[PDB]
Amino acid sequence: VCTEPLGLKDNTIPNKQITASSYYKTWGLSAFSWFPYYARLDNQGKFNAWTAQTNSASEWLQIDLGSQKRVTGIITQGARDFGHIQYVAAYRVAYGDDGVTWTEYKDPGASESKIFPGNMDNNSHKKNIFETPFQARFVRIQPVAWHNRITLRVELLGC
Known part of the structure; x- marks a missing residue:
């Protein structure tokens, strides 16, 4: 029930709707930016994911679903960077309606x-x-x- 891809992998969700606290640039080059909108599940290529500029605990990847939707799950991947694997081992999920106010997810009770x-x-x-x-x-x-580094490729599930 529900559990459907919300538009990350298939690019249904536009780039402008995916942002982050910051992002990394290989060799400091703007052309080699690991843009937040590259954090799409199964994204192929050489700069195929979002990687935060710095590795702090206050980094975040924001997805604007474009409208109120039912969110039932999430899927993530890391990504390779030259001779190094990078991925997020643990994370929290926050959500809201206006993108300024957030509710940290937590299991019932x-x-x-x-x-x-x-x-x-x-x-x-x-x-x-x-x-x-x-x-x-x-x-x-x-x-x-x-x-190694905060790197993500994501898919949101729902309906």
């Missing part, structure tokens, strides 16, 4: 926001189905733990 189990390599998919689904227009992925 629980203190402290949920820290989701993430990836363990560069291409394997990690899917998490929310115990309690929610409705929102904006969703943010907040990496908590990472391997």
